[PDB]
Amino acid sequence: SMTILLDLAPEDKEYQSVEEEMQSTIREHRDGGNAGGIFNRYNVIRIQKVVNKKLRERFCHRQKEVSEENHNHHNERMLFHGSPFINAIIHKGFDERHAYIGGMFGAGIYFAENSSKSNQYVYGIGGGTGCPTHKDRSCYICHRQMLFCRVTLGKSFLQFSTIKMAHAPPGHHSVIGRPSVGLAYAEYVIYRGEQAYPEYLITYQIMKPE
Ligand SMILES: Cc1cc(N2CCN(C)[C@@H](C)C2)ncc1-c1ccc(-c2nc3c(CO)cccc3c(=O)[nH]2)cc1
Ligand SMILES: [Zn+2]
């Protein structure tokens, strides 16, 4: 459906809040930077607010159903999502028919509290072949994009190791993978696309350390 992208000004508190969450949640990955590249900082190019009436309608309708099953609590969290399918997401919304089958919690839609974890999926699973132009997973030239999303978690089912599932457990609305001594970083899983709204579209580069 019809999507409008509104540019946030770098001087605005809103743009600054999104960049602060993005920059401050960067951490070192176990693959030594193979999937997302080697960097300790991003160069934020643009931050846009995604406006889509039909997506907002579907998200708000689902929030009400979740609230009803969760003592009138949405349990909403702002979380990162990196994907080669950014264009489809901002126009058509998140779709569980395009879930990550290979995911450690089964065929769900995966979100991160660490921007660096989502950066590992911008070009595909495991970084795929990298940027389309230079076939480089650590490309410092190409402008990357990721989303900072409103995610309705409702009643979360907490897990610490791999358990493949198709849907959240009975009475639950999401699955959370927690880090332990185990997972390196937390993973947030929804099994219904309408439980996430792609609120912010961030255009950035990973920065090559000096
Ligand atoms: C589902 C899929 C198919 C595909 N394909 C292209 C080639 N082909 C067209 C098909 C084979 C299909 N490429 C990428 C994805 C995909 C996209 C994003 C993620 C993703 N995962 C995350 C995780 C998983 O642990 C944790 C934390 C955060 C994230 C995150 O932000 N994003 C996973 C997979
Ligand atoms: Zn490139």
Side-chain angles (χ1 to χ4, degrees), residues 3-5 48-52 90 147 197-201:
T3 299
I4 289 185
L5 298 175
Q48 295 159 300
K49 211 157 180 181
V50 176
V51 183
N52 181 307
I90 68 165
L147 299 165
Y197 186 89
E199 188 84 356
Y200 302 101
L201 180 61

Side-chain angles (χ1 to χ4, degrees), residues 3-187:
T3 299
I4 289 185
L5 298 175
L6 301 174
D7 276 76
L8 301 184
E11 302 81 22
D12 178 13
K13 221 192 93 180
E14 193 171 8
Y15 176 115
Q16 290 167 15
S17 183
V18 169
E19 181 164 4
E20 174 180 55
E21 296 311 324
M22 199 205 183
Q23 301 285 12
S24 71
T25 60
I26 288 167
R27 297 293 186 273
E28 168 204 295
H29 297 284
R30 292 183 169 149
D31 70 0
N34 182 60
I38 303 152
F39 64 98
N40 53 70
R41 202 77 184 175
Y42 304 114
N43 173 39
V44 172
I45 303 288
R46 196 163 68 239
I47 305 164
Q48 295 159 300
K49 211 157 180 181
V50 176
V51 183
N52 181 307
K53 187 179 164 81
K54 266 94 206 80
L55 293 207
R56 179 176 174 271
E57 282 181 325
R58 283 195 77 207
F59 177 82
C60 295
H61 177 93
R62 183 58 183 156
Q63 282 185 311
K64 292 176 98 283
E65 299 186 327
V66 172
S67 260
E68 276 162 34
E69 296 189 318
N70 195 40
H71 302 91
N72 306 117
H73 307 308
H74 301 140
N75 184 20
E76 188 183 295
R77 269 196 68 150
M78 288 306 296
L79 297 165
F80 298 100
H81 187 81
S83 176
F85 306 108
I86 267 205
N87 187 60
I89 294 162
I90 68 165
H91 283 95
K92 293 171 251 173
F94 282 98
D95 187 348
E96 72 287 343
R97 295 174 282 190
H98 287 289
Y100 176 34
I101 305 142
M104 90 179 288
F105 302 111
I109 308 163
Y110 289 72
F111 296 86
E113 58 181 30
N114 297 98
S115 69
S116 57
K117 175 68 182 176
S118 282
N119 177 66
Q120 298 189 298
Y121 298 90
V122 160
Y123 294 134
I125 293 153
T129 54
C131 67
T133 313
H134 312 98
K135 261 63 222 67
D136 188 358
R137 285 189 292 277
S138 194
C139 194
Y140 303 111
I141 302 147
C142 298
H143 294 188
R144 295 170 184 229
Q145 296 183 312
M146 80 166 65
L147 299 165
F148 191 39
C149 308
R150 290 187 183 264
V151 185
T152 303
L153 299 166
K155 195 190 211 299
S156 289
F157 180 68
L158 258 70
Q159 290 291 273
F160 302 88
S161 60
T162 180
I163 175 101
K164 307 263 179 175
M165 65 186 87
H167 313 289
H172 296 69
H173 309 94
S174 60
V175 166
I176 299 169
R178 285 295 317 158
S180 67
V181 294
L183 260 177
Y185 302 104
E187 299 188 1

